Amino acid sequence: NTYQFRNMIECTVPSRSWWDFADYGCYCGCGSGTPTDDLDRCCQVHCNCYRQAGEISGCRPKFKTYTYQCSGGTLTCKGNNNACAASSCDCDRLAAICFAGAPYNDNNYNIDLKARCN
Amino acid sequence: NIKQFNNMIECTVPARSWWDFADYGCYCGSGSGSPTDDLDRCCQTHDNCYGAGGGSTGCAPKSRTYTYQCSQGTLTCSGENSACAATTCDCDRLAAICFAGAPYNDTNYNIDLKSRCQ
């Protein structure tokens, strides 16, 4: 669920408030257009990841509670997870790890989506 | 679906595109915090409407394709829509209708959410 994903982020990127990713580029907040950079593409793969999970009957990625452990840059989705929960958890985790390896460009935060992603 | 909603929006507000609402206030885009104005509210209940519709078995708002019609600024959902389509459709036309009537404040577009949406 959203809350768990927020933790993975604080996990892999402690030097930043999860808000730093609530409105970055064209995808961190989820949308469309040309990803403005590596970090934005991270979010691009994450939205698409959520979209595939939605194809599993009854699966609401945004709300599905899953089992994971986030231990200092280390993220682990637990096996006790079902298809929906397992898929959701791997989306968030991979996105959290992805953020950790992509530079964060202050320019790309809160950009004009109408003009830049359309 | 959202493709149909994007267009519903233009039916009632042809002078604008859905993009003017993609990043407006604290909701038109996602969801969190205190509504900013009437417009930012139209979006709050739209999301709520979707949340109510998700409760409808097998119903996926952003993806369910419904049968609607736009005729000179006025929207109409057709009858042959399944329980899920009909609900989603209505959600969208009420939102579209709510957007046309609310005031659009440039000052509340592209806002720093990390400071106004806690």
Ligand SMILES: CC(=O)N[C@@H]1[C@@H](O)[C@H](O)[C@@H](CO)O[C@H]1O
């Ligand atoms: C609270 C939270 O983490 N919300 C995430 C956001 O961080 C992420 O940037 C965006 C795009 O992937 O998807 C949202 O669901």
Ligand SMILES: [Zn+2]
């Ligand atoms: Zn452990």
Ligand SMILES: [Zn+2]
């Ligand atoms: Zn923004």
